[PDB]
Design a binder for this molecule. Sequence first.
Ligand SMILES: O=c1ccn([C@@H]2O[C@H](COP(=O)(O)O)[C@@H](O)[C@H]2O)c(=O)[nH]1
Ligand SMILES: O=c1ccn([C@@H]2O[C@H](COP(=O)(O)O)[C@@H](O)[C@H]2O)c(=O)[nH]1
Lengths: 208, 208
Amino acid sequence: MIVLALDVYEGERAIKIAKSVKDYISMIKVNWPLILGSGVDIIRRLKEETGVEIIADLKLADIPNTNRLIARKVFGAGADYVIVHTFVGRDSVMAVKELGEIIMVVEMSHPGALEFINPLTDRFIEVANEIEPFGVIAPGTRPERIGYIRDRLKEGIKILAPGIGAQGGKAKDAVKAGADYIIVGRAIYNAPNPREAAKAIYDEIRGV
Amino acid sequence: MIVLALDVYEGERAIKIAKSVKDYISMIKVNWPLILGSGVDIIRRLKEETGVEIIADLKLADIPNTNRLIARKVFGAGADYVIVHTFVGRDSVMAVKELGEIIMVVEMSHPGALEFINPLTDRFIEVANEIEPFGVIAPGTRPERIGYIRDRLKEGIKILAPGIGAQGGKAKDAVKAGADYIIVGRAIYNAPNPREAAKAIYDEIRGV
Ligand SMILES: O=c1ccn([C@@H]2O[C@H](COP(=O)(O)O)[C@@H](O)[C@H]2O)c(=O)[nH]1
Ligand SMILES: O=c1ccn([C@@H]2O[C@H](COP(=O)(O)O)[C@@H](O)[C@H]2O)c(=O)[nH]1
């Protein structure tokens, strides 16, 4: 269930960390920091070095034409999934979905998410239900909201929850609430021993 | 003042276009397509080749920590301004502003913008007024909305309007409505003669 969020700038550093924790993860999530620091080709290299699927957390939020230009390049680089915002509207979301599997942001994990996003959660779930993306982003920092979303989201849609570890969210609470994937970044990549850190979360989720 | 939206993947091609239309533009806007295609260093290259200010249209929309990590690399690469979304919250906006000048999205130009963004325009204007970014994004496709925003937006904040040309917006109307800058991409870079296309729009806005 663990999704490693590799938010370091250095590509070889990312590959080293990924290889050391590969045994305990399900997927790797890359964001702009690593792409900016190593080039988009880092996606293909991570997949070849680890054998796991790659999620490109781009938080796409532009007009349809630009979302298309971006997504085609990133899916072309090997991304298995692309995360897109829902607030920019249906047309921008579809421009990306036409190119590959997507994950729609429903509710974010940080404090600022309560200002405009959280108040529209119901509406976003409605859009996700009609579009039917591979999954949606729910707040690992607010497990009660993960349940809220799960209860209203079509069964076939998965829930991925970031905000575990550094942001304060507990892996066990998120899984119990209905998260299918547990996104973990700093708690693993900033740990003195990333493998030991990943194993601890892996054990927590197994309930041992 | 024309801002060139250089949304092509190829760096040498982008530099050629920029140099050919320099006489008629005031700034160059780089988005993810060019950054992905040529690397973030393309920003430094464009500035060295044209001597014009560069806007990094990243539409940042992540949590505070990640927004900082991204802005660090982009401002570090020479970006004079970074575009960030307001929807994600004030904390995410300030994480970027603490590192350099920003432009906040208030209302977008595509059809999808009417679903969630447009209904919250009043609130977004309020946030922009409190943060005081260099400028905000207003819809070149909806001139009447540009004037609406300008009247309620703090005097010192500039308005940049994309959606001119390809999307149907008219440059004269946007400027007349209160846009300080009009962003133009395809109408220029998709043109057989980029310089001629830029000059035509330049003459269109002369004498507002
Ligand atoms: O609502 C969201 C959406 C995305 N992310 C991303 O998930 C990862 C969380 O990393 P960390 O807080 O475990 O270090 C980062 O890439 C962050 O940008 C969040 O944290 N919260
Ligand atoms: O509300 C917005 C915000 C940003 N952009 C950006 O402005 C440029 C418009 O290019 P074009 O329609 O002139 O080709 C592109 O980079 C697009 O991503 C918009 O078009 N509308």
